[PDB]
CSV table of C-alpha atoms in Angstrom, one decimal:
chain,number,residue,atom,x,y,z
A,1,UNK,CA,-57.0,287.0,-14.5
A,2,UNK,CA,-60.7,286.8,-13.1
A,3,UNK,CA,-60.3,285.5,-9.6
A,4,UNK,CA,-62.4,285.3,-6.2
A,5,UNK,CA,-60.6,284.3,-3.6
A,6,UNK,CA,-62.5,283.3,0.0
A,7,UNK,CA,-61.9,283.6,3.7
A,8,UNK,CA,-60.7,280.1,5.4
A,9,UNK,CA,-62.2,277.0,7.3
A,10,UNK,CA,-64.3,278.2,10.0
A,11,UNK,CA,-65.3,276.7,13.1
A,12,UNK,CA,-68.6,278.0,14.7
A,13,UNK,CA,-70.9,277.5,17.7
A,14,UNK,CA,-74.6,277.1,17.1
A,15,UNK,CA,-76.6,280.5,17.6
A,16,UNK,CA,-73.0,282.3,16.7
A,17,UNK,CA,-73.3,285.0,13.5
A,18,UNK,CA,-70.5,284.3,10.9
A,19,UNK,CA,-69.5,286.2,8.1
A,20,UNK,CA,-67.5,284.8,5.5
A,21,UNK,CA,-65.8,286.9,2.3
A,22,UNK,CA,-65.1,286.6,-1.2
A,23,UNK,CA,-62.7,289.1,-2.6
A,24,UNK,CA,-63.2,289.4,-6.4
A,25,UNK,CA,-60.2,290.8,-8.3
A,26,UNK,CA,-59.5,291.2,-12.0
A,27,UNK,CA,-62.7,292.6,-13.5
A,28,UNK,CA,-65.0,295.5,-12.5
A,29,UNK,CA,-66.9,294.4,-9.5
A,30,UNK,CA,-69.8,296.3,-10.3
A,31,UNK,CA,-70.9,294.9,-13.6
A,32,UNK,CA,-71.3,291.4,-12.5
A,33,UNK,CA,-73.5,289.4,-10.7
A,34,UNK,CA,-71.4,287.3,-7.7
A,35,UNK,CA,-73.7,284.4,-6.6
A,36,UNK,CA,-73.4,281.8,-3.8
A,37,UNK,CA,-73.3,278.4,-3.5
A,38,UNK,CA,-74.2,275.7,-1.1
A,39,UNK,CA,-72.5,272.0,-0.9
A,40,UNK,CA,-72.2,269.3,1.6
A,41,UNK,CA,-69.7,267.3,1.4
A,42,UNK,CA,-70.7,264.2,-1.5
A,43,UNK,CA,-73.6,266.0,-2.6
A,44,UNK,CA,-74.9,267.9,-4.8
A,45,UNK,CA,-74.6,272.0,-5.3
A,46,UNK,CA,-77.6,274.2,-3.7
A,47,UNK,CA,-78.0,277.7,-5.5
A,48,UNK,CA,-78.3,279.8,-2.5
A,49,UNK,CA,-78.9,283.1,-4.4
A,50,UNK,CA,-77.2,286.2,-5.4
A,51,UNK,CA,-76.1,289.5,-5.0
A,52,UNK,CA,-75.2,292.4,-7.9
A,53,UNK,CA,-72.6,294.6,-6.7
A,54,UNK,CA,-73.6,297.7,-8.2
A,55,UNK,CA,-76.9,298.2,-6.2
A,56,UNK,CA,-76.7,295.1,-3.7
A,57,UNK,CA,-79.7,293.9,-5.7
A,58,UNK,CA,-80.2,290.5,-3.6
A,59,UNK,CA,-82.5,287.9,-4.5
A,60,UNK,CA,-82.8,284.6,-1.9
A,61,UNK,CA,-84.0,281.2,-3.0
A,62,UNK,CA,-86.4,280.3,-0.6
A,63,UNK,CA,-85.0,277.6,1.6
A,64,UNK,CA,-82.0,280.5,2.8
A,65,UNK,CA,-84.2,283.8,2.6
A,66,UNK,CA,-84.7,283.8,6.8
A,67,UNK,CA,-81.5,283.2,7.8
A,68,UNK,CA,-78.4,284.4,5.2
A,69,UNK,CA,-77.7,288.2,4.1
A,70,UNK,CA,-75.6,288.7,1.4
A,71,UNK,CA,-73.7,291.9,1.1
A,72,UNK,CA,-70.9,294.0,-0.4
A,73,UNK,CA,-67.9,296.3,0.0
A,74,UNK,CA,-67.2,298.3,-3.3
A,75,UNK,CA,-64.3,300.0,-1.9
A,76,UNK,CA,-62.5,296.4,-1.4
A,77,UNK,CA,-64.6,294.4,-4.3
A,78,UNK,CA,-65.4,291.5,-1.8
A,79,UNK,CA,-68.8,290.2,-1.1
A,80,UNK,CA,-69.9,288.7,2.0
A,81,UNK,CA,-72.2,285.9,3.2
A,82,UNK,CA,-73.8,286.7,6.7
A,83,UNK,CA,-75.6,284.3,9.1
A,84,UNK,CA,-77.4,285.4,12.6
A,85,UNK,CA,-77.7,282.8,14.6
A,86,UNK,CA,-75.6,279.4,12.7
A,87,UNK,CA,-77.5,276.1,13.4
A,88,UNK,CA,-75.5,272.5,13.1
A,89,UNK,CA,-77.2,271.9,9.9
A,90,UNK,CA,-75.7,275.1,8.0
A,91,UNK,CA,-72.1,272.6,7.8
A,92,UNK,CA,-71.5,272.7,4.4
A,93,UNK,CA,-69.0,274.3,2.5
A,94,UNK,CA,-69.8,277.4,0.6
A,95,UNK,CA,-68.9,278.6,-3.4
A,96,UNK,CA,-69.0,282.5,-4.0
A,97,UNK,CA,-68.7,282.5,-8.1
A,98,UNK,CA,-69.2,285.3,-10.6
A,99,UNK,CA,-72.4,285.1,-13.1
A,100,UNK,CA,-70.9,285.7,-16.5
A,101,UNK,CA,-72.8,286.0,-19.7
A,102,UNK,CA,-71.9,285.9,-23.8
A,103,UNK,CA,-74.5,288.2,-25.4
A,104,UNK,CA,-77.8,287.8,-25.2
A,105,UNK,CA,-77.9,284.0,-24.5
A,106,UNK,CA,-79.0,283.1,-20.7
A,107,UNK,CA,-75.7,283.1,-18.3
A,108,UNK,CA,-73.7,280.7,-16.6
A,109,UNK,CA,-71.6,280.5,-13.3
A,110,UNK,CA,-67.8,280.8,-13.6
A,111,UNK,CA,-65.2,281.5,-12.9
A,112,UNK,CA,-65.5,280.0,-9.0
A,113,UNK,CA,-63.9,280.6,-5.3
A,114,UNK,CA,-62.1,277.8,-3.6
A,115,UNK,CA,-65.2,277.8,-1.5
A,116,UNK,CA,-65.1,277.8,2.4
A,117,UNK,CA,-66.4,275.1,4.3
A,118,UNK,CA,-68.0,276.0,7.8
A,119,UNK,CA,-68.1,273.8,10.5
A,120,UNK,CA,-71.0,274.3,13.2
A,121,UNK,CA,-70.5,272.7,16.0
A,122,UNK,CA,-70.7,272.3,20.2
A,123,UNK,CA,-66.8,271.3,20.1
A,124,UNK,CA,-63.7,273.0,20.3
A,125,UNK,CA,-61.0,272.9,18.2
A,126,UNK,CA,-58.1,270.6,18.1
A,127,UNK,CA,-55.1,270.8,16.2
A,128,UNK,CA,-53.1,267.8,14.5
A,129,UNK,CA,-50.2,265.5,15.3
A,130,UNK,CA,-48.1,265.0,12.1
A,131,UNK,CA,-46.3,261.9,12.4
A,132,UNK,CA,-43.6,260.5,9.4
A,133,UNK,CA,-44.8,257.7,7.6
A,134,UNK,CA,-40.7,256.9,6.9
A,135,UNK,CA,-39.8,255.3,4.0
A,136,UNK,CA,-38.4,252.0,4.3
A,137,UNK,CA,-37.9,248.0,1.9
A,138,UNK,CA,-41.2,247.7,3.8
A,139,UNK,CA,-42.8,250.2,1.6
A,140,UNK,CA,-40.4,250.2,-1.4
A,141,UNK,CA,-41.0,247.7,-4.9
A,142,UNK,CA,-39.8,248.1,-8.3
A,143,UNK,CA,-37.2,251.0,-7.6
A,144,UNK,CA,-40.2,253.2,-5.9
A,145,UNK,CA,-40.3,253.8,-2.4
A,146,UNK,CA,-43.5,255.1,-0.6
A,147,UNK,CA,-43.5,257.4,2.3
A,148,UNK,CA,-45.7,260.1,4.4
A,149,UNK,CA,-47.2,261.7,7.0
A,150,UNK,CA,-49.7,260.9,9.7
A,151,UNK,CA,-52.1,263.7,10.5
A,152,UNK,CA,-53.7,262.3,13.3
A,153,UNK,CA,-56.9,263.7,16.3
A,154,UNK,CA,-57.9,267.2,14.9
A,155,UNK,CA,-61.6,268.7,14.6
A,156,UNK,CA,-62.9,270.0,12.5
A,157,UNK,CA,-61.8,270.0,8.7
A,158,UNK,CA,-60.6,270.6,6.7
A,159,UNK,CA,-56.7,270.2,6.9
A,160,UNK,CA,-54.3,270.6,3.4
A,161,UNK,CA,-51.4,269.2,3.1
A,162,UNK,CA,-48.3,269.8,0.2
A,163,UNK,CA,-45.2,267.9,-0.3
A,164,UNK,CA,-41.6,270.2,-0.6
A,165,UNK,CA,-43.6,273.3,-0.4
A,166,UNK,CA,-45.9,272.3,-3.4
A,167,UNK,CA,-42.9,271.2,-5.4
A,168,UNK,CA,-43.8,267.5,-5.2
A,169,UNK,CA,-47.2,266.7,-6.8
A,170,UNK,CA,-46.8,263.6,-8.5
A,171,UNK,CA,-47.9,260.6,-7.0
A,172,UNK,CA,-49.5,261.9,-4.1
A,173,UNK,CA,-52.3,260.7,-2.4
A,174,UNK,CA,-54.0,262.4,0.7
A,175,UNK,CA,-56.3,260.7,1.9
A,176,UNK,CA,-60.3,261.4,3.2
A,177,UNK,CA,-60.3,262.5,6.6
A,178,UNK,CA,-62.2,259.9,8.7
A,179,UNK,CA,-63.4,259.9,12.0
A,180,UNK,CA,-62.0,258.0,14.9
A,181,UNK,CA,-64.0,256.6,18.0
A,182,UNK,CA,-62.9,259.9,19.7
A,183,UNK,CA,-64.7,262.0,17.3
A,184,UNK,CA,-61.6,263.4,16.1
A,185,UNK,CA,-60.1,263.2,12.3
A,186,UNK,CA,-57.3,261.9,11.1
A,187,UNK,CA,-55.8,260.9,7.8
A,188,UNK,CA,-52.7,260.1,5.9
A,189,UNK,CA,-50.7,261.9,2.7
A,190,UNK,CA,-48.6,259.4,1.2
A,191,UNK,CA,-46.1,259.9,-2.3
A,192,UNK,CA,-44.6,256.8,-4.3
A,193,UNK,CA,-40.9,258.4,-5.3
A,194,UNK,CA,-37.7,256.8,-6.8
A,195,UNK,CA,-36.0,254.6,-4.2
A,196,UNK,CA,-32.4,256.0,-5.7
A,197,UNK,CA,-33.6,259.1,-4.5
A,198,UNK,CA,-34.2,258.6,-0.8
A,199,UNK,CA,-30.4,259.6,-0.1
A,200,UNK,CA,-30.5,262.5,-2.1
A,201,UNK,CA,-33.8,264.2,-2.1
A,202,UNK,CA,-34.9,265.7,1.6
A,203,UNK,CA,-39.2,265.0,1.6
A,204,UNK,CA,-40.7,267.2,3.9
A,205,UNK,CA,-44.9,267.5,4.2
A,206,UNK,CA,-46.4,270.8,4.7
A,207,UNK,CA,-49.7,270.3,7.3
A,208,UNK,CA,-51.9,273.3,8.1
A,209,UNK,CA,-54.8,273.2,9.8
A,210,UNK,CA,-56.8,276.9,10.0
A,211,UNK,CA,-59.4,276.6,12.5
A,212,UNK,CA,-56.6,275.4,15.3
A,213,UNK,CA,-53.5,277.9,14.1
A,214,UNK,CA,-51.5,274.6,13.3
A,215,UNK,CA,-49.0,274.6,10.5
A,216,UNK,CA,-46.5,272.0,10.8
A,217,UNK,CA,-43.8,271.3,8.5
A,218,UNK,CA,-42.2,267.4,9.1
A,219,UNK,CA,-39.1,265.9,7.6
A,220,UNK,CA,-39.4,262.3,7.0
A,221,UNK,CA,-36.4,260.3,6.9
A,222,UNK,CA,-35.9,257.0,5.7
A,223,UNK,CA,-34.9,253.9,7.6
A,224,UNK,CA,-32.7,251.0,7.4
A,225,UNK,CA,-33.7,247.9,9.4
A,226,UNK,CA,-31.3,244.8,9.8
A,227,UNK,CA,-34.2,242.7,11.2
A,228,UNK,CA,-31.8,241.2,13.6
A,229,UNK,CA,-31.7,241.0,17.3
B,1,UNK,CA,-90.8,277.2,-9.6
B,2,UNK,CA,-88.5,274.9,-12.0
B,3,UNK,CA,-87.8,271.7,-10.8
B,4,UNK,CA,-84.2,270.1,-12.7
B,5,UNK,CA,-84.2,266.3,-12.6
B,6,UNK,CA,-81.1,264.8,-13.9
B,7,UNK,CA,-80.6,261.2,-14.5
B,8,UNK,CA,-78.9,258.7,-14.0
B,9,UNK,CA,-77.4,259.5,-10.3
B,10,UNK,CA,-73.9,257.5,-10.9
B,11,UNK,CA,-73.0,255.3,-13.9
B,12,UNK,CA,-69.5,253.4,-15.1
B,13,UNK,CA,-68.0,253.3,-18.4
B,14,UNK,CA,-64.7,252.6,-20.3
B,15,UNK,CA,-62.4,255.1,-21.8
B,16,UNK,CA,-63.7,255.3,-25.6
B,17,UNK,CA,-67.4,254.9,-24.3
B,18,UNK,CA,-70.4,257.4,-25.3
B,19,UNK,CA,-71.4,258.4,-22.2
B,20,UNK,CA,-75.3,260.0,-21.9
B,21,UNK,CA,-76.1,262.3,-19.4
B,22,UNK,CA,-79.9,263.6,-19.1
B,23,UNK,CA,-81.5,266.9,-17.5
B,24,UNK,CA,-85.7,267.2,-17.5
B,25,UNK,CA,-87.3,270.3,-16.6
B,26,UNK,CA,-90.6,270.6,-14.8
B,27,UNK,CA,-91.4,273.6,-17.6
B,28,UNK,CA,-90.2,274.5,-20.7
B,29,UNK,CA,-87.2,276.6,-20.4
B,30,UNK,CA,-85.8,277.2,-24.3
B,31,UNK,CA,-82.0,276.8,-24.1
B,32,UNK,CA,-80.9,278.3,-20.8
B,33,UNK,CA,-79.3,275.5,-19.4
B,34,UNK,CA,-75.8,274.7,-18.9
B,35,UNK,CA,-73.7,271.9,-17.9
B,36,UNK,CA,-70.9,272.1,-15.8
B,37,UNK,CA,-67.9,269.2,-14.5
B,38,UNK,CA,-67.0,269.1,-10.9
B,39,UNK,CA,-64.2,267.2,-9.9
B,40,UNK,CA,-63.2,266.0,-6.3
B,41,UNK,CA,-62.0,268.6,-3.9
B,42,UNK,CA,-62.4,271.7,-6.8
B,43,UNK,CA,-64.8,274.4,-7.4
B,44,UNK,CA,-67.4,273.0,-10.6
B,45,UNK,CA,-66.6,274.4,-14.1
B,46,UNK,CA,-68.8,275.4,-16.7
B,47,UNK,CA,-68.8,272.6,-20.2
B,48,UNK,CA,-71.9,273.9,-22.0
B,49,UNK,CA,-73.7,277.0,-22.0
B,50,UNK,CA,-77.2,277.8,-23.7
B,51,UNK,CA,-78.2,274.0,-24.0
B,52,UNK,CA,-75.3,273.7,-26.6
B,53,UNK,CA,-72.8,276.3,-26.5
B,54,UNK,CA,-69.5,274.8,-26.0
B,55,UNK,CA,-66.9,277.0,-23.7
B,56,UNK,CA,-63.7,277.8,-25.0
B,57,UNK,CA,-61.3,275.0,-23.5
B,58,UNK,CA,-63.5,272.5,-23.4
B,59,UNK,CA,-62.4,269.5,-25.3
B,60,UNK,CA,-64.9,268.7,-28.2
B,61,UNK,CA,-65.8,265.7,-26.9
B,62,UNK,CA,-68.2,267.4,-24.7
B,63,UNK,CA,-71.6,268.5,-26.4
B,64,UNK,CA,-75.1,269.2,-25.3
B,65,UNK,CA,-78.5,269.2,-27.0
B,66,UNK,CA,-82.1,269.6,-26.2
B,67,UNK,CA,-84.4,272.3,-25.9
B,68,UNK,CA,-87.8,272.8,-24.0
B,69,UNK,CA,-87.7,270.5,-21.1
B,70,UNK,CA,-85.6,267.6,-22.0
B,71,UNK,CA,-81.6,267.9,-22.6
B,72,UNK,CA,-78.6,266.1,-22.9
B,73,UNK,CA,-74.8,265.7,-22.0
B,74,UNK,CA,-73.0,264.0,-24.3
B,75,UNK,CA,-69.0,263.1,-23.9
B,76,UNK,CA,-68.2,261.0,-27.1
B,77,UNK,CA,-65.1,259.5,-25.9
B,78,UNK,CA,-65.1,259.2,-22.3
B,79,UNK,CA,-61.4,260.1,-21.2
B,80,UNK,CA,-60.1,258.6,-17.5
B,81,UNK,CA,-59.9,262.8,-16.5
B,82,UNK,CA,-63.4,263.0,-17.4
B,83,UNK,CA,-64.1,261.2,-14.3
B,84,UNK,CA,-66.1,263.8,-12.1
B,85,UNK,CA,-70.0,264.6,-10.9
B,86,UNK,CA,-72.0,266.5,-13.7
B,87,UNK,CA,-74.5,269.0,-12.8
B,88,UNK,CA,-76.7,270.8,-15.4
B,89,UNK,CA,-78.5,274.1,-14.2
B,90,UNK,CA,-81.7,276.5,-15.1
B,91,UNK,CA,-81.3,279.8,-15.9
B,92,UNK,CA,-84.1,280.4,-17.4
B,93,UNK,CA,-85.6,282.1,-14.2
B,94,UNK,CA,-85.4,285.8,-12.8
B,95,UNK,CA,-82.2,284.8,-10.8
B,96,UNK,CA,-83.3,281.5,-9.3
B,97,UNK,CA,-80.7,279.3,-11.2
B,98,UNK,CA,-81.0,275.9,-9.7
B,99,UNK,CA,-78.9,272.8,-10.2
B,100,UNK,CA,-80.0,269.1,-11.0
B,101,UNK,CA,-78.9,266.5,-8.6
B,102,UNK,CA,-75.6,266.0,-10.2
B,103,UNK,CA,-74.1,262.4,-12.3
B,104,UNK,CA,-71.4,261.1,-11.0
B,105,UNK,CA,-69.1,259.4,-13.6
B,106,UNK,CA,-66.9,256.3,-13.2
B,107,UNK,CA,-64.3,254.7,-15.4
B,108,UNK,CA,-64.0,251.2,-16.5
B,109,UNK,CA,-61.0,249.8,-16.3
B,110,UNK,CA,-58.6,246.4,-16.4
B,111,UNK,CA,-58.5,244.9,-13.1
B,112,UNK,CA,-55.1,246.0,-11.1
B,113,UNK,CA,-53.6,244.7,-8.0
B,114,UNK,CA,-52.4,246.4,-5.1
B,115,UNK,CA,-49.0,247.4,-4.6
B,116,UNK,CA,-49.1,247.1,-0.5
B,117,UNK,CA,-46.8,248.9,1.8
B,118,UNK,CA,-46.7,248.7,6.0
B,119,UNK,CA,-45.2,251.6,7.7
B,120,UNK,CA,-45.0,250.8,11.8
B,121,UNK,CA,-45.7,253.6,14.3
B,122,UNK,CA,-43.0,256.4,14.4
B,123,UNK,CA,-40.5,256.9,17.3
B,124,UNK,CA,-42.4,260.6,17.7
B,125,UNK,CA,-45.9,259.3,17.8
B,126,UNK,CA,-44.5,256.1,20.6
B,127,UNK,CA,-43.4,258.6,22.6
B,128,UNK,CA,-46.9,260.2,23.0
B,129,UNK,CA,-48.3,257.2,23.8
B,130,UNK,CA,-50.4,255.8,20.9
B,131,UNK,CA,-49.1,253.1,17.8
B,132,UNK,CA,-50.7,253.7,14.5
B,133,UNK,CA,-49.6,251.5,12.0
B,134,UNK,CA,-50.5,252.3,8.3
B,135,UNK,CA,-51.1,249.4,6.0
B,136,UNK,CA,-51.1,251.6,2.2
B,137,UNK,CA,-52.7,249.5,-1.1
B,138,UNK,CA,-51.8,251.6,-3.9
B,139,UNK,CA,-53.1,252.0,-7.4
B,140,UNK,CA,-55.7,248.9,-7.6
B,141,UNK,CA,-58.9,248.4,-9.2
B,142,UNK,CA,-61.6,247.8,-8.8
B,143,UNK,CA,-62.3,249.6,-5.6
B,144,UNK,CA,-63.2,246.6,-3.5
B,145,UNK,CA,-60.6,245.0,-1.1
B,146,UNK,CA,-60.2,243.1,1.8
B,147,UNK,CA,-57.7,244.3,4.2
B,148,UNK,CA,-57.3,242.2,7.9
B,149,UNK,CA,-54.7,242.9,10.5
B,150,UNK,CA,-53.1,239.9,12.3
B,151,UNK,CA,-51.1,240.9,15.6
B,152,UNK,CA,-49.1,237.7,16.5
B,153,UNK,CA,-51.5,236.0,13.9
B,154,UNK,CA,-54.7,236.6,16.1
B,155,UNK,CA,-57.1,238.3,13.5
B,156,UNK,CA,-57.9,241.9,14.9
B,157,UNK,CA,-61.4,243.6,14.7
B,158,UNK,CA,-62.8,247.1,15.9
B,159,UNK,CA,-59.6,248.7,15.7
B,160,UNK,CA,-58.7,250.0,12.3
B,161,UNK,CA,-60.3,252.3,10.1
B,162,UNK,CA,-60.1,252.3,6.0
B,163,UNK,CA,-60.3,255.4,3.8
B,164,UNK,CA,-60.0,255.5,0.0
B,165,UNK,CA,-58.8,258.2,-2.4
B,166,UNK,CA,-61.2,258.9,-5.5
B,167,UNK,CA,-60.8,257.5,-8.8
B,168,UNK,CA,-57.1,258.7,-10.3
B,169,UNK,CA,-57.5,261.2,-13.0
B,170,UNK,CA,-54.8,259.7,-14.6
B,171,UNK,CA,-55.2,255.8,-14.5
B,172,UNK,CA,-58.4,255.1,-12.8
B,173,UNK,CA,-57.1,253.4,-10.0
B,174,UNK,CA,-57.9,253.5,-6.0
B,175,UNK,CA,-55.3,254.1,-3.2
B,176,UNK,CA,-56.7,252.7,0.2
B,177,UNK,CA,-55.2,253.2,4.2
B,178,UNK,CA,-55.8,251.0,6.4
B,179,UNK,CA,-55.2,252.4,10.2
B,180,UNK,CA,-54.6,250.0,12.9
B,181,UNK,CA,-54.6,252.5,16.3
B,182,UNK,CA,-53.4,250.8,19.5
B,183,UNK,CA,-52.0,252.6,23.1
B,184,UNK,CA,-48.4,251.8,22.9
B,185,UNK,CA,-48.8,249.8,26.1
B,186,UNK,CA,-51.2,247.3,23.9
B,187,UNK,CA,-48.6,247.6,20.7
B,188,UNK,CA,-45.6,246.6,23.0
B,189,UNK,CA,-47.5,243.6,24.2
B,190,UNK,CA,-47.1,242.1,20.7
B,191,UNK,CA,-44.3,241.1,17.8
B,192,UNK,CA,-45.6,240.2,14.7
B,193,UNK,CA,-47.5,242.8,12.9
B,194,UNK,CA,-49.2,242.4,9.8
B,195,UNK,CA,-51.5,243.3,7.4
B,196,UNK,CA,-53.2,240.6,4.9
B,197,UNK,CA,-54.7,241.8,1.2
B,198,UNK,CA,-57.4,240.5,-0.6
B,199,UNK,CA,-58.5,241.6,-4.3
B,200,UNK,CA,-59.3,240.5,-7.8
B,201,UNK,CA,-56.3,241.1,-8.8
B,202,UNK,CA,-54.0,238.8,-6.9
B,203,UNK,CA,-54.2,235.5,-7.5
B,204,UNK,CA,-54.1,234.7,-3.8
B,205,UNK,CA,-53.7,237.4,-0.9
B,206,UNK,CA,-50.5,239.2,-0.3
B,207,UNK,CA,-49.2,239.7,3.5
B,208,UNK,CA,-47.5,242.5,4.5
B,209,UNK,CA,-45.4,242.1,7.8
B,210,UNK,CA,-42.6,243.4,10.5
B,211,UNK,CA,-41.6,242.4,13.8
B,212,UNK,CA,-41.6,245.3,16.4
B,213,UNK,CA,-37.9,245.9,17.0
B,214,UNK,CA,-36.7,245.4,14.2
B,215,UNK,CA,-35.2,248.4,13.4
């Protein structure tokens, strides 16, 4: 299987130099072009430019040429992207991808890396709460009960969160990170499940958050509420 | 220097709908241009290569045409997982490859009302000294609702936040949070908590409540 795989989140100062990697596996490095890849986040995808393994043959598009080096290491297939000095308006997240061609007819970009998203910033990191959205009849209709986790006051993104170690995928919902008064991120991953099941089955989220060494895992238990006093 | 202008920016159409995606050229540039899907949170992946070469995988409803300076996306059936941004792409120059702006594609769909949930702060989060309570509307459309917070039915404002998941890949519906954030010294002042829905498809807007204490 064809595969690139890239280095985490990253949090950077301005003027700070960053490299970030793309370890190619699955293919001879050295026969393929591996190109990069600029989005922000809800827009569109920026061809940064390119870089052939075999004689690190790099071309630039013109808008990154001053400031971005690509580069390789043969001996562990990866390529890397290299800044000097970041600025705040490099924030973006970045593809690495292999060029890939049938024949003679022009090429196309594929297969991809998960792409790394690079945050430049004056701020210091700060990692997540994780608070249990519990089920309860308050969020339970129809035999399916709702329930989550709170993943509150962390900079900067990206955090991922799974549900029973990536067992649980249906009905999921995690939702865009959005940004409190404080400046901080927080967001909520909720799942719809079978109320019979809230006895039986333990739900546990699975919260990481990179750029602050945070990995939380959180039970969350269901409640029973009499509503009296 | 090629120049890719694709058009339209966004559109919305219904499952079974020809949808028409179009990529101009500011030069001719024969047939090598591709198309590629990007849905949210993933990598893009390549449809269409060469103008009209379909990728192996890719369902046939997908097809592109057009040579020159002027091509087009096709999806003949459009499917509720075909819901993504499109992006077409030169590479007709010596390794500048560049994108067009991208499409983003919406689907149609029957109006669905909220099914709305209210979780109150947890114990743990009390205990640090802040009350979120989460106010969930799942699987509605279309994406516009109203969501208010009443705290001992005094109408709140500047202290919640909203986000919204993307269009399901499955059924086309939204989810939607709504975040009311209080100190726990301002959350134990009150009762009645409650969250109040508004959408097309309720016939008249559904409340969501619980009195703190009682659990």
């Amino acid at each position: 299987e064809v595969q690139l795989v890239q280095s985490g989140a990253e949090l950077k100062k301005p003027g700070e130099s960053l490299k970030i990697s793309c370890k190619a596996s699955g293919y001879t490095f050295t026969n393929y072009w591996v190109v990069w890849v600029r989005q922000m986040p809800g827009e569109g995808l920026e061809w940064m430019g390119s870089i052939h393994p075999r004689d690190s043959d790099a071309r630039y598009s013109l808008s990154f040429e001053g400031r971005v080096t690509f580069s390789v290491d043969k001996s562990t297939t990866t390529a890397y992207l290299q800044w000097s000095s970041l600025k705040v308006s490099d924030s973006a997240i970045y593809y690495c991808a292999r060029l890939s061609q049938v024949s003679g007819w022009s090429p196309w970009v594929g297969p991809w890396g998960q792409g790394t998203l690079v945050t430049v910033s004056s701020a210091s990191t700060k990692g997540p709460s994780v608070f249990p959205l519990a089920p309860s009849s308050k969020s339970t209709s129809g035999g399916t009960a709702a329930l989550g986790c709170l993943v509150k006051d962390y900079f900067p993104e990206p955090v991922t969160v799974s549900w029973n170690s990536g067992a649980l995928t249906s009905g999921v919902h995690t939702f865009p990170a959005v940004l409190q008064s404080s400046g901080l991120y927080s967001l909520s991953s909720v799942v719809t499940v079978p109320s019979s099941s809230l006895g039986t089955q333990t739900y546990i989220c699975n919260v990481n958050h990179k750029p602050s060494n945070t990995k939380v895992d959180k039970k969350v238990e269901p409640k029973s509420c009499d509503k009296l006093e | 220097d090629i120049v890719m202008t694709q058009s339209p920016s966004s559109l919305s159409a219904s499952v079974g709908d020809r949808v028409t995606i179009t990529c101009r050229a500011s030069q001719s540039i024969s047939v090598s241009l591709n198309w590629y899907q990007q849905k949210p949170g993933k990598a893009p992946k390549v449809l269409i290569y060469a103008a009209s070469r379909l990728q192996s995988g890719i369902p046939s409803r997908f097809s592109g045409s057009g040579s020159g300076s002027h091509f087009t996306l096709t999806i003949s059936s459009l499917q509720p997982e075909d819901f993504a941004t499109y992006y077409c792409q030169e590479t007709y120059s010596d390794l500048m490859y560049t994108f067009g702006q991208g499409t983003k594609v919406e689907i149609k769909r029957t109006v669905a009302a909220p099914s709305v949930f209210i979780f109150p702060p947890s114990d743990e989060q009390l205990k640090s000294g802040t009350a979120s309570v989460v106010c969930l509307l799942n699987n509605f459309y279309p994406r516009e609702a109203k969501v208010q917070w009443k705290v001992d039915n005094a109408l709140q404002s500047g202290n919640s936040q909203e986000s919204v998941t993307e269009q399901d890949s499955k059924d086309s519906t939204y989810s939607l949070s709504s975040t009311l954030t209080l100190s726990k010294a301002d959350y134990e002042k009150h009762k009645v908590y409650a969250c109040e829905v508004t959408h097309q498809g309720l016939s008249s807007p559904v409340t969501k409540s619980f009195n703190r204490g009682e659990c």
